[PDB]
Scaffold this active site. Sequence first.
Site: not given
Ligand code: NA
Lengths: 203, 202
Positions: A21-22, A44, A72, A91, A105, A109, A132, A155
């Site tokens: 996913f990442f 790194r 989260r 994103m 968003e 959201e 990021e 999701e």
């Molecule tokens: Na969002």
Amino acid sequence: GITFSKNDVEIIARETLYRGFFSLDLYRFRHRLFNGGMSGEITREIFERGHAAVLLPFDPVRDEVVLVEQIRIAAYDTSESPWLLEMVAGMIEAGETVEDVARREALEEAGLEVGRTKPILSYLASPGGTSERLSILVGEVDASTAKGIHGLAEENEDIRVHVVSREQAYQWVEEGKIDNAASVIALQWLQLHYHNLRNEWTK
Amino acid sequence: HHHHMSKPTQQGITFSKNDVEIIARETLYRGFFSLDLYRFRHRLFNGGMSGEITREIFERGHAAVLLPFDPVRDEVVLVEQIRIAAYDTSESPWLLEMVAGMIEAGETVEDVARREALEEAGLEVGRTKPILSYLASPGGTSERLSILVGEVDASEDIRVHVVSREQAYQWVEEGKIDNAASVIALQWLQLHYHNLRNEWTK
Ligand code: NA
Ligand code: NA
């Protein structure tokens, strides 16, 4: 201030460590030294997840902020609860502007239609280990229109909207009840700028 | 009673750690840092529990951060060094930052903050006070950073800068300081410096 540029860096390679996913890449590089010459080879591990637009929804008429709440799980090990109070965010896809994403968003959201916006700040979340960047705007909203449960079941998102006074939101930063970077940065900015912002948006 | 719910003034989060079940954590990658898959289910706002969800989480430990502030001179110390992860979104990967370091096994924020101020900036710290402790980016990493302000006299390949507080905050406004720890610390200082200078010069 600073001295050096990207010409003072050699990225020898970015080696894929994990793709899912990442992603995680090993950056292998050399860079110029303050006292002259080039460094040895440095490696790194860098966490790559793209970059985000963030919107602080502020109702300047009512002096209210709209927060979103959702789990989260990464917060679990160091936080009272993994459910956090946050700014809306998403994103930035290829070619998109911060403002377009922030407005979208806010609607997706939190169900919010944004009026005017202003930039807050754009920041690197934790540049010792992740690329990021998050770019924050403040967005004018009518906090009588912020309600309901949001998120895409596609999701596994489950999101609640909270409308609070600006004073309460900031007190929660002071108390540690809001303690994620994007919201702390946005709400400290708001504490420094709310008087002039309310004037600008209620003129 | 569930049909006479009357807590109007009560605000804040809805659910506790008892409302989530972490089923397992599976390591996807472990070198120096790691990436874990958390498998979990959690309560839903409208009732019931989710099914099993998985999320990738970047695990790199947690940090102590110190804002070095000279209250006599109204100066701040910044450390400059390359952070290669800044490369893709910044004109330069050399960043101006707060002193910071990892909290190792068994260590405290204050001990680490004081140690890093000496090792990273050559500073002996007097008094300290907490600023804030924050999650860097909790949608993808567990990392928490806990910031203190440390009293200093301002008189890796690192360059140490001593600037006025005013200049440091202007650099936040201008985007020249744009890493979370430094932005948070310097915004805090802008909101609290009158009181902090009074407290530390009394
Ligand atoms: Na969002
Ligand atoms: Na350090």
